Structure 1
C-alpha cells in the first residue's frame, strides 16, 4: 500500500476532538456562522446538521475543499445527531424566518415545535455542551431550549442583542467618524421591535454623549439620535427587503460569542439570559442584559443603572415577551 511505503504508523488513535463546535441548520445563517468560525480558528472539528440531506452534504464538501486554506482539520455532517458527539458548543440556527414586514414573534410556535425534536437530540450526544440559540424569536427560544434541555441556565445562551448593539455602534461610528470599536453603547431587552437603547451609557472615550446632549434619544433631540435605534430595530427588515434574508452580520456576531466561550474570555456581551430578579421581573423571562461570557457560558450579569424612561422601556420589552411566552406548551 502506497501509504505504508511512505509513512510508518506509530499510533492508531481515534482522534477525539478537544474544541468541537456543531452548527445546527445550514441555511444562510448557519453557513455564515460556519465560515466565520472556520476563519477565526475556533474549532478543531466542525459538525453540521440539517434535515435536507443533499444541501447538507454539498455545504460540507464545499467547506472541505477549502481545507488547505483553513486550520480546522475535520469538517463533518449528518442528519444523525451522533455526528455532534463531544461538542463544547452547539449553535442552533434552525427554523422558520420572518417574511418581509413580519415580526419575529410570528415564528414562535413553529420554531418551538422544531426545538422539541432538535434539543433532546443535541443533549443526548453532548450533555455538557453550551447551547447558543440564534433562531427567532431568540429570547423565547432560549427559554424553551433551557426548559427542554434541563441544562443549568449558565449553559443556555441566546445570541440576543449582540448584533443590535454591533449595529448601534456601527451607525454611531458612521455619525461620529470613529471606528465602532471606540463607540460604546448598549441595546438591551428583546432582539426585536421592543429593544431598549441605553442612552445613559452611550459614550466615546468615557465621555457620555447624554452629558453633551441632555435630550439624547428623546423626541426633543435636535439630532434625532432615536432614529439610530429605529435603524437598529429596522435593520433586519431593510436587509430582508433588499437581499431577501440576512446572514453575514449575524454570522460574525455568533462567531464573536463563540470566541468568548471557546477561549474563556469573560468579555461582556448583551445576550439573552434569565432576568428573573432584576428591574422587578418575577417570571422566567429571558432577554438581553450585559453578561460575562466564558467557558461555562454566562457566569455573571452586569447590573445596569437604567433611567426611569429606560427602565420603563425595558419593563415593556419584558412584558411583550412574557405575553407570548406565558401561553406556551411543549
Structure 2
C-alpha cells in the first residue's frame, strides 16, 4: 500500500477534547458552524439535522475548506451518536417566525421538537453544556433544562447577547465610536418586551444618563428610545429584506461558545433562571448579565434597576410566565 510505503505507523483511536455539536443546519446553524470554525474553538465539529442530503452537503462543503481551517474533524449524521463527548451542544433547530409574527408564536412547535432533540443530546453527552438558540429562546431554555435534567448552570440561552450587540452597534454609529467602547445592556426577553438599561449606558465610564436625565424616556429630545425600538425590530426588518437572519446570531453564538470553551468568565446578557431576583418567584428564564465559563453560568451580576426599569423587567418576566404556564411536555 502507498500509505505504508510512505508512513510508519507508531500508534493506532481518536477521542476529541474540545468537540462542539450544532443541531440544525438551517442558515442560523451554518452561521454558527462557520463562525465556530473560523475562531478555532473546536477540534471536532458535529452537525445534526433531519434532512439527510442537506446535512451531508453542508458537511462536505465545510470539509472542502479544511485546508483553510484548524478543525481537523467535521462530521454529520441524523443519528445522535455522532454528537458523543461534546463539551458544548448548540440547539438551533425549530420553526422560525414569519415576517410580522412574534417569536412567542413558535412556542408549542419548538417544544415538541425539543421533546425529541434534548434526550438524544443528553444520552450521548451527559456532561455537556447546552446552548439554546431556537426561539422563543427564554422559554426553550427552561424547557431544555426540565427535559435534560441538567443543573441550571449548564443550560444557557443565547438570550439578549445579540440584542445588546445590536444596541452597542447602533449606539456606536450615533456616537462615532466602535461598539467595543460603547456599553449598554438589553435584558429580559429576547423579543418585544426586552429592557434597555439606560442607567448603565456609557462610554469610558461616563453615564449617558448623567448628561441627559431624560435618556430613553418619551421626554428625550434625542429620542434614544428609538435605539431600543430598532433593537426590538431588528429581526423583523432583516426578515423583511432578506427573508431570515443568520450572520449576527452566528457571531453572537460563537462569542458565547468562546467564553465557554476557553473558560473566560466574561459577562454576557444571556438566558438563565432568575427565581429570587427582582421579586420573581417562579422558574422563569430571561437575560441578566451572567458570568460564563467552562461550567456554564456560575454567577449573575445584580444590576441595580430604577423603578421604571424594574417595572419593565417585571413585565417581561410576566409575559413569559404567561406562556410557560400552560406547557406540559
- Hey, what does 1:8 align to over in structure 2? 8
Tell me the CA shift for residue 138 of structure 1.
Answer: 0.1
Cα distance in structure 1, aligned partners of 2:213 and 2:14: 59
Q: Which runs of 5+ in 1 are unaligned?
A: none
* TM-score, with length taken from structure 1: 1.00
Deviations 1:159-189 (A, max 9, x none): 0000000000000000000000000000000
- Hey, what does 2:162 align to over in structure 1? 163
Tell me the CA shift for residue 51 of structure 1.
Answer: 0.1
- Hey, what does 2:99 align to over in structure 1? 100
Deviations 1:220-278 (A, max 9, x none): 00000000000000000000000000000000000000000000000000000000000
Tell me the CA shift for residue 284 of structure 1.
Answer: 0.2
- Secondary structure at 2:89's aligned position in 1? strand
Cα distance in structure 1, aligned partners of 2:309 and 2:282: 20
- Hey, what does 1:147 align to over in structure 2? 146
- Secondary structure at 2:289's aligned position in 1? strand
- Secondary structure at 1:43's aligned position in 2? coil
Extract structure 1 runs of 4+ deviating beyond 4 A: none
Tell me the CA shift for residue 107 of structure 1.
Answer: 0.1
Cα distance in structure 2, aligned partners of 1:175 and 1:50: 41
Tell me the CA shift for residue 192 of structure 1.
Answer: 0.2
- Aligned residue pairs: how many? 329
* TM-score, with length taken from structure 2: 1.00
RMSD, aligned α-carbons: 0.2
Cα distance in structure 2, aligned partners of 1:313 and 1:204: 24
Tell me the CA shift for residue 101 of structure 1.
Answer: 0.2
Deviations 1:58-105 (A, max 9, x none): 000000000000000000000000000000000000000000000000
- Secondary structure at 1:170's aligned position in 2? helix
Cα distance in structure 1, aligned partners of 2:294 and 2:324: 28
Cα distance in structure 1, aligned partners of 2:328 and 2:22: 26
Deviations 1:106-139 (A, max 9, x none): 0000000000000000000000000000000000
Tell me the CA shift for residue 290 of structure 1.
Answer: 0.1
Cα distance in structure 1, aligned partners of 2:40 and 2:247: 17
Cα distance in structure 2, aligned partners of 1:114 and 1:302: 32
Cα distance in structure 2, aligned partners of 1:6 and 1:125: 37
List aligned pairs for 1:48-197, cutoff 5 A.
Answer: 48-197=47-196
Cα distance in structure 2, aligned partners of 1:275 and 1:192: 17
- Secondary structure at 1:181's aligned position in 2? helix
- Secondary structure at 1:190's aligned position in 2? coil
Q: Which runs of 5+ in 2 are unaligned?
A: none
Cα distance in structure 2, aligned partners of 1:16 and 1:215: 57
Tell me the CA shift for residue 207 of structure 1.
Answer: 0.0
Tell me the CA shift for residue 308 of structure 1.
Answer: 0.3
Cα distance in structure 1, aligned partners of 2:280 and 2:310: 11
Tell me the CA shift for residue 7 of structure 1.
Answer: 0.1
List aligned pairs for 1:221-232, cutoff 5 A.
Answer: 221-232=220-231
Cα distance in structure 1, aligned partners of 2:216 and 2:233: 16
